[PDB]
Amino acid sequence: KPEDFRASTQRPFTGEEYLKSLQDGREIYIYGERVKDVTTHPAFRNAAASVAQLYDALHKPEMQDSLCWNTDTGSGGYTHKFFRVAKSADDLRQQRDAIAEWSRLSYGWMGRTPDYKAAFGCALGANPGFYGQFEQNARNWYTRIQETGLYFNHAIVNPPIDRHLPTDKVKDVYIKLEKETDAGIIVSGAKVVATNSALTHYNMIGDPDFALMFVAPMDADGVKLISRASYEMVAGATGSPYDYPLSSRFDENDAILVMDNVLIPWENVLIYRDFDRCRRWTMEGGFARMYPLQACVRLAVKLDFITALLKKSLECTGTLEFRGVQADLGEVVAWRNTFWALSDSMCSEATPWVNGAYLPDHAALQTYRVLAPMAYAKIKNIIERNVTSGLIYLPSSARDLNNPQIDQYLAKYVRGSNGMDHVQRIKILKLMWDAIGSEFGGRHELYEINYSGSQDEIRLQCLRQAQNSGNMDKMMAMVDRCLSEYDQDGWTVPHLHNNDDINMLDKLL
Amino acid sequence: KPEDFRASTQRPFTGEEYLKSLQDGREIYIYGERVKDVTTHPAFRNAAASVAQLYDALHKPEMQDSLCWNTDTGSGGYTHKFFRVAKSADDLRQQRDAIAEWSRLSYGWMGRTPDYKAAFGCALGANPGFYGQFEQNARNWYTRIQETGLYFNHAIVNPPIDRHLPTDKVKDVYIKLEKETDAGIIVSGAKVVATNSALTHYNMIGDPDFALMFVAPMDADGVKLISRASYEMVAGATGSPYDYPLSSRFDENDAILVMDNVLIPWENVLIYRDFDRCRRWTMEGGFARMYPLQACVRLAVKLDFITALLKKSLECTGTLEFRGVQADLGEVVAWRNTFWALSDSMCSEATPWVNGAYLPDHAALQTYRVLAPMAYAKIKNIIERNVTSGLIYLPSSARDLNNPQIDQYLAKYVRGSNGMDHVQRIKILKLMWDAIGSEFGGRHELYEINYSGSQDEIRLQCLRQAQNSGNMDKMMAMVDRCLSEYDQDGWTVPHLHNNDDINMLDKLLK
Amino acid sequence: KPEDFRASTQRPFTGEEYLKSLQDGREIYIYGERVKDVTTHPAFRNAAASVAQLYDALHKPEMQDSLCWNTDTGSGGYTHKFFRVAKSADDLRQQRDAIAEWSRLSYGWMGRTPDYKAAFGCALGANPGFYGQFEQNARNWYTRIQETGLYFNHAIVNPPIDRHLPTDKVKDVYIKLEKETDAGIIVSGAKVVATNSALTHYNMIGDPDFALMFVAPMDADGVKLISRASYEMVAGATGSPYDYPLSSRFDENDAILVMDNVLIPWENVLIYRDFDRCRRWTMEGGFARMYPLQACVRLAVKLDFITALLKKSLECTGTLEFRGVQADLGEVVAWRNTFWALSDSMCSEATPWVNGAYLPDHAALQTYRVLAPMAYAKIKNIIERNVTSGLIYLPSSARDLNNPQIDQYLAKYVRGSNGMDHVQRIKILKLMWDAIGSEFGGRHELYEINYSGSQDEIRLQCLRQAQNSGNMDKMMAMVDRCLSEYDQDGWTVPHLHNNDDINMLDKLL
Amino acid sequence: KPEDFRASTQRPFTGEEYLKSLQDGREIYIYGERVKDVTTHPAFRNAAASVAQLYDALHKPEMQDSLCWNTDTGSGGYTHKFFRVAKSADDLRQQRDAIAEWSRLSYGWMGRTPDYKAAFGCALGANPGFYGQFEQNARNWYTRIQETGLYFNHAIVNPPIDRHLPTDKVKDVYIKLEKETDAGIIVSGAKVVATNSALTHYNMIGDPDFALMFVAPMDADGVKLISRASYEMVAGATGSPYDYPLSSRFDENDAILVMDNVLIPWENVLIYRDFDRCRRWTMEGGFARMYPLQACVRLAVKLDFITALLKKSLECTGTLEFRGVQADLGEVVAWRNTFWALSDSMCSEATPWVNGAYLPDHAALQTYRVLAPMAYAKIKNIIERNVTSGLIYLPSSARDLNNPQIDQYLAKYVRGSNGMDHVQRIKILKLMWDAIGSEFGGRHELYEINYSGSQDEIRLQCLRQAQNSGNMDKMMAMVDRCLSEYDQDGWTVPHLHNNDDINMLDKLLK
């Protein structure tokens, strides 16, 4: 139904069609109230408009070489390159570049755009046989996501459990099968951290009644979102675009997704009462082996933005001349370079998987995940220790600049160091502040550092990849070879010299 | 005079008297508008009430042992202990404890309360001879600050300069003498980072026309503040106390202070067209040698709060059971302990200064300044890597809890791990979020890491203190002694063995 | 018997008496050979001489005000201040200063000097009633250690266990009671990390047969040490004092202590088949609450040395003029200052304990333990990144300086930046290298970072101290007070303003 | 000529031929004595044997697919792949893999093997026109290095200068032209950090008399090395292979190289009295744009080794079971992965340069240089906090294991946690200790952190590369676009909503 808002079946949504497709009476709450229409609501309307611009870019003739491919479905249509299964390392590189072009439309700040779950679509299309009796659902969902550009999110993090409650009552907390019918399955439960789900068409949701994976439409009866605070709405109500230039347009609301007696049609079921497939899906389904290409590129585009924003901030404060400041900026550049290089390795070392599909280099994926929190924390610390005074006393509002009684003083006392007027100085530094210190900036720090999992778990996943791939045993073979070349009596290889002719310990002792 | 709002001259303001003293038509702007009355304005009214609670505490009988001393002026009155010159190490310890008690009333979140510039009053009273012809102004301001509890701030950071402008035009940016008159001096210019000046009575403001230090009242004609965004107002307009429990009451607005043709009477001048005294004041005036006792204790109280708030957050999420989580919490405890220990050393190693006054240990002050940014950054990182999942999806509003259509789901899906209901879980985690992630939390991170100087400069000040005190030369004497005990021919001291009897190099190489 | 080498019972050993007391046929191995005499052996003779200098300092008239007190035993003698129980905060401060004076005789590099276990002596004398039937042994050992200056070490770390061995055979690994006799107990087993035990008189060694604490003489039959590599001997055999100025005189050999059928007289037993007392000893015995005063001061003296050595190294390389270098040096100063300040707090906040004894502030002890590894790692990193080129190419040997064919080039090409000749430049930088990069320097990095326990365990001990003392509940009371002042309907205290008059959410939504 | 020790001109040295070529009476000092023969001297003989094994690998049939290519000279011979100019991204990838295979023969511990300066040979062969009148010398040296596998090092770091000396006297410290003759130039001066030059055939050495670049043979009269302490000799004299398994065979002595009246024939001169070419050579000559491929791969191979050695050490101590230990190991794996990934990017993003040659990605080179010191420091810290107790008390010597009076106790008390006997436990942990804590280990820490420049300078080089490439301006164009989309009156683009309909500030403040 959502794709029926398109005027053509041979291309994805335009932005205008996407926005119309959201006017479906989805059940969303924020600040204790029901949201009538996400495309007009003060908490969501600009974020929706920002996503709609991504869809518009797909149809600009000058963008289509970098953004789009023909579909592989026989439709005669086209789609964003990352919505179609890659069949070579170069395909992955072209997808890398198409993701980057989309990411640049939000300067790297929207991390859960439609291309993130395009990797889920492609995993379905590349390995549909994984799903057994639901193999045809996988194939059909791949085709649908690819041709239409359907916006998916995933809701996968389980709600907290009160350990002191009876084991009776806590089975109601997790997503669980309630009833099996001929029309599909009825499910109830919740998932937390449903980031930007208010703007999606579908969410993937992932005792055998708990071992499910299925697709849920956002407008299905019983599907509800409970929103977190809206940095977009607060910036609109008490600020301005000048004062909160990122909060006002790129806020991705991290919701709780609730399912209350929701009917999931059988066509939307992918794994059903199946602990074994649920267990193997992360390794074998492909999604976890593919989405970090998007996530790494998106972060790299954000680091492009932050790197130059730091340079511009240091230009206007005048400290960029100093050697130590330039060295700090150079380290930020190195971190920015790192994530582009990891995405290079992802594509260049890609491997054949199944049915001709290629997967990016797996070690590079795990490495991006471990390094990103450290890099982001270090960059934020570099920014704050270099743009010291300049951020703390910024005037409250564009209203200060627009009142000549106040502006007369700002014009004298808050100019930029490099011939820059006060309006441009304050503008640049307010952009940096919205990037790192606003509530939006603080949420993004949380997102970049912890969202991918706990620091232990991401390091364990890195170790497990090295072991499962055989890389660790290959490294161990080198250590074992080294140990084999000597023993407690001396060398065991002929090319090295016995030290008996020079050993002085007998003489000494 | 602001202190004439008191019903008695033998004690500082009560909270109600302090609030009345602020209703003086000071000129403050925020969001393009003039503020009518800071005690009722949506951007300032709770922060003002929060400071007023500090004044109220001074008059509670159960608080006076820890908070108050008699004045040393002969007035028969009393004051907060840090407003009177300390004359022993134990005096400093009592002041340390009185600062701590006041700091606990904002849980460590208000950093520019009146006790901060009480150290400026005491510096004036302890070394008034520093000021030459203005020595009597120093004595009189000490007496006035001490007896009244007048709220001072300092505005000292200079505004930025456009280097491409002519040298004419940019000299108007700094505070400068414009006119010398019989009634005082007329001055214009600006200072940035006038933290909480909207709630103060006076600010200290510090080619000889630029070499000035003087006191300016907040209600003087031509003194103006241009405010930054108000986290208090935003939290009031789009949130609630439950949702922003710190933003809503402890926001200290970091303003730009503008002076436009302000007449400063001669009794308010402390340094006048005097580069030499301006240069020597940081070392010799005493203020810089005394206020870090207040700042270190205030930070330590905040770390008390953050330490236990982290523990409570880990209780809520259930991860406190884990060894690695308990170790992370234990490191936060160690950082918290560090700043209390530094303040112990400040008092125990205090030194006689001038006129019977004592100064806290100088090395401890420099050390606190270097360590605080690293500790705060490390603690914030520990918090985020331990409690993040719990913070990211918190419902928007107390309004969600108060709508049963939503609360029915929150009650089921967001309970605490330890038998705790969802209201208390969400409450604790929203408090942690306001501490570290809200715009208020982000400002406080900037404040703790950056306010005190650049990272280079605070380290240079630490090195210079070690050198100026003679500590570095004493350390160097130990290295020189070590070097003196051998040379290229062997040991030069008799108690160690020549290695000639065991050296094998000739055998190996000849 | 060892103290009978003294010519007087009213003072501790002189250095010469101490050295004679070591010539007792203790059983020590190194490099596969038995050590005849530690005071003349190439691996130990200079370290022994270094310790002997500590004993000599006790008898210099100009040193006795800072180093010595009258004994509290009625002997009419004197002793090092830290060997006598402190009865006030000022006593602890005087002990702090007496420890520092001894530490300066090794420039902070000997960490297991006799004053470390003087705290064990004082714990015995302050709380002898802890030991029940062995209370009189505690009293008698306090008197003996205090009057004589007996050199104790502790051997407490258990050897590793092969988990695949039968539970039979692994009971022989740990120290265990073998036989109870009227002459004492026979024990066998081992302890690792018996640091400098080769130069001690006694070691404290700490199914009920495993729950023991007792004192073992180094010359008891069946007591044996297996030494690690001797940096002293290697520096003597292949270097010189000029080339290894710290290795050659301050090496504290980290031995394995073996007990093979050792008879421990009953007078040497302190805890016997007593799991309860073994468990409570760390909290209640006092030793763990007292020795970190010595350890913190010793580290602070070492940081005094390293701080000025870094400054001197940067003077001779010429980089001290640079702002960033001076800032790095200033951070080293701050770390150095930190440990002196912690020792100040230890003394100033000291508390009455039992029998009039005072204990240093407990939180300060735990804090020193957590901070020291981080500070030492950071300082070493600051040194290496600032004294870059200057360390890597230092000529091999004082023999190079003493051969004019080589010295003619060193004199031209390796001068100091500040008018300093090549001999002094090379000398300073070789001292820095021996401090951080030699095998001795690497061992000291290991010692400062990990010896006090694992990074987790030292942080857990810090948390437990805060909880056990009630500090954590006091901090929690402040958080609870904050939470009590509002609820989901608004403030619960009268002094703050209700936001109902300014709340805009109804209008917005 | 050293290559005349080969039995064939159509391949590089064998190991035995390389060792014979070193028996040339080069002038090397160590411990105050002249070295007679580096291939037999106790300070150099195993390091020489270790390098010789690299040459032997080139001629093993099972190794030649990964190690060797035909020469491009028309000689009909073969060479190590990194000794021939790369003409595509795939060429660089094959070279990357050939470097890795050689690096594995020292487990990543020898960092100045012959393939390091093979990039200098290739730079000469790819851009010989850079050298003007010496272009033909560049071409000829490329041919010679490529066909023979000649072992070059570079000596480029200048000796320290005493600033208190007269300006006369300190100009004799640097390498300088002394005499211009028909047979070549006579030069004197010194360079420090001539790593492993004792085992090389030639060194590149790089007021116009100071602006030189030339090649000097190690056996030229007047060329001398003054060695640092030999970890190989000390390990041989006072240890054993079991006790110091890396020190005993992989020590690369960091010498001072002295030139005293050395005649450099004109065929060995590349830049002569030419400040402009000296200044431009780092950017334009190609060597600096090519050798970091070798250095990054060599480091990655060492991290392969250290990663698994850590795992094996944690197996020995039994702590690998613990979650926090496995996480620490996983971070070491991530750092190891990083440098392999950087080398992937170096090859995949390679660019056409000049004369058909390709250069590796420049940003990746700069990134490797900035990241390597932080990674190595972090890894060493992870190792020490996980395996320290196991390292501190290891028995002194294989002699302890071989004396049954001692071994009886070691067999009981120092077993491995996982059914491993004491000999193997002690062996693994002594290998880890030689890697990180021995004097060799400490030198390698200095080498990985500091050799490449100061921490400031390597970051500045990274920034300059981003600016010079145009990358920074492209990033800045994105920031400028963002700024262009709004102003102080609202949005300037049509797709976003004006907030005038929801802005509440007038209501709040009017």
Model description:
The structure is a homotetramer. The first copy, chain A, is α+β, with helices and mostly antiparallel strands and 509 residues long. The first copy, chain A, has a domain at 287-469: Butyryl-CoA Dehydrogenase, subunit A, domain 3 (Up-down Bundle), CATH 1.20.140.10. In chain A, 49% of the residues lie in helices and 14% in strands. Chain A has a six-stranded mixed beta sheet, with no helix packed on it. In chain A, strand 6 (176-181) and strand 7 form a beta hairpin. In chain A, helix 1 packs across helix 2 (45-57). Chain A is globular, with a radius of gyration of 27 Å. Chains in contact: A-B, A-C, A-D, B-C, B-D, C-D. At the A-B interface, strand 7, helix 8, strand 11, helix 13 and helix 14 of A face strand 7, helix 8, strand 11, helix 13 and helix 15 of B. The PDB classes it as oxidoreductase.
CATH architecture type of the domain at 287-469 in chain A: Up-down Bundle
CATH topology of the domain at 287-469 in chain A: Butyryl-CoA Dehydrogenase, subunit A, domain 3
Q: What is the spatial order of strands in the main beta sheet of chain A?
A: 2-1-10-11-7-6
User: Under the CATH scheme, which class of the domain at 287-469 in chain A?
Assistant: Mainly Alpha
- The helix tally of chain A amounts to 21
Largest interface: chains, residues each: A-D, 101 and 101 residues
Could you state the CATH homologous superfamily of the domain at 287-469 in chain A? Butyryl-CoA Dehydrogenase, subunit A, domain 3
Q: Radius of gyration of chain A over alpha carbons? A: 27 Å
Largest sheet of chain A: 6 strands, mixed
The N- and C-terminal alpha carbons of chain A lie at a distance of 90 Å
Strand content of chain A: 5-15%
Number of strands of chain A: 16
Q: What is the helix fraction of residues of chain A, given as a range?
A: 40-55%
Q: Which structural class should the secondary elements of chain A be placed in?
A: alpha+beta
Shape of chain A: globular
PDB class: oxidoreductase
Keywords: protein engineering: 4-hydroxyphenylacetate 3-monooxygenase, oxygenase component, oxidoreductase active site loop mutant 7.2, oxidoreductase
Assembly: tetrameric
Entry title: STRUCTURE OF 4-HYDROXYPHENYLACETATE 3-MONOOXYGENASE (HPAB), OXYGENASE COMPONENT FROM ESCHERICHIA COLI MUTANT XS6 (APO Enzyme)
